[PDB]
Amino acid sequence: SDPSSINGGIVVAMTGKDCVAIACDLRLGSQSLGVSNKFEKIFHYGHVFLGITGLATDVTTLNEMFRYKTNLYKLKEERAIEPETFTQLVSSSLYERRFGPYFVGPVVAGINSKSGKPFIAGFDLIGCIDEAKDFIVSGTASDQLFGMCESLYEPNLEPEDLFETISQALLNAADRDALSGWGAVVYIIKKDEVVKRYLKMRQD
């Protein structure tokens, strides 16, 4: 009866040279039982990417909520929301439910369309912003991902290299968590192109 570890799963985000990468596992379970191996945890609103770990009902609900909010933003502002601004909107929306929170660990990744600056951020369930140059980690294998990232990561990696580093960070972290794995997706995000790769990993 700990909402954040019923369904399980992980998200990791990393910055490179004029690029960002965000990756997640595909597992949804009911504690010990694996249910779905196609549960993606990474959504995009224009060019801003959001990964969400935690209680799966809240992951779906928050995706639907931020789609709603960014759709209205675009209609009124007449432009796509930027990562920095979206980060503030996630923080606002979570802290609104301060004493009845969404059991989630969201991660924002994207490139500012004006400045071209790579941007990543993480949050707790009540909307505290962790802004980081290097990397952000979330989910049931966060400890594992912190270890992998802190040792594997170096600054100003090229897209092709950054792909290998984030992939190896996720795969090796998931294999040491019972509630993570069952497949993985990596988004490589450049200024004006985005490649999405499904990784081959052990299915146990």
Partner 1 sequence: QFNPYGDNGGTILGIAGEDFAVLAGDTRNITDYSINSRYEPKVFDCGDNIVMSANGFAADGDALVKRFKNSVKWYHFDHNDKKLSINSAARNIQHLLYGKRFFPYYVHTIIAGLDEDGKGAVYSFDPVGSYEREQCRAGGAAASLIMPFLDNQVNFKNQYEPGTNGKVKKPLKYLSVEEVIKLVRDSFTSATERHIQVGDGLEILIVTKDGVRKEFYELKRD
Partner 2 sequence: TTLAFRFQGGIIVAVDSRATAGNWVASQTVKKVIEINPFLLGTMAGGAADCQFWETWLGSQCRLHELREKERISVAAASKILSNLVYQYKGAGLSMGTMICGYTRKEGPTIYYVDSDGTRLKGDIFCVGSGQTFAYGVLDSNYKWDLSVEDALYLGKRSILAAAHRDAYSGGSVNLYHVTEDGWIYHGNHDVGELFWKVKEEEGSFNNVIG
Partner 3 sequence: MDIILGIRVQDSVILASSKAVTRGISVLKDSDDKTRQLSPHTLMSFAGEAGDTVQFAEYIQANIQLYSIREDYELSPQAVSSFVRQELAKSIRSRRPYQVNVLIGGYDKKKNKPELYQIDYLGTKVELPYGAHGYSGFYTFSLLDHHYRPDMTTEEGLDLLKLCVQELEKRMPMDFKGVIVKIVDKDGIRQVDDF
Among 4, 22, 27, 35, binds partner 3 (CB under 8 A): 35
Contact between 138 and 11 under an 8 Å Cβ cutoff? The reply is: yes
CA distance 139 to 60: 15
Residue 198 tokens, joined: 């499904």
Q: Identify what 61 binds: partner 2, partner 3, partner 1, none; CB under 5 to 8 Å per kind.
A: partner 3
Contact between 135 and 111 under an 8 Å Cβ cutoff? The reply is: no
**37 lies in the binding site for partner 2 (CB under 8 A):** yes
Q: Identify what 55 binds: partner 3, partner 2, partner 1, none; CB under 5 to 8 Å per kind.
A: partner 3
- Rounded to the nearest whole angstrom, what is the least distance from the CB of residue 175 to partner 2 in the complex? 7
Question: Stretches 26-34, 47-55, 105-113, 122-130: which one binds partner 2 (CB under 8 A)?
Answer: 26-34
CA 99 to chain centre: 24
Contact between 166 and 12 under an 8 Å Cβ cutoff? The reply is: yes
* Footprint on residues 125-154 left by partner 1 (CB under 8 A): 143-144, 146-148, 150-152
Provide φ and ψ at 49, rounded to 5°: -100, 135
CA 73 to chain centre: 21
Q: Identify what 57 binds: partner 2, partner 3, partner 1, none; CB under 5 to 8 Å per kind.
A: partner 3
Question: Which residues in this chain contact partner 3 in the complex, by CB under 8 A?
Answer: 7, 28, 30, 33-36, 38-39, 55-57, 60-61, 100
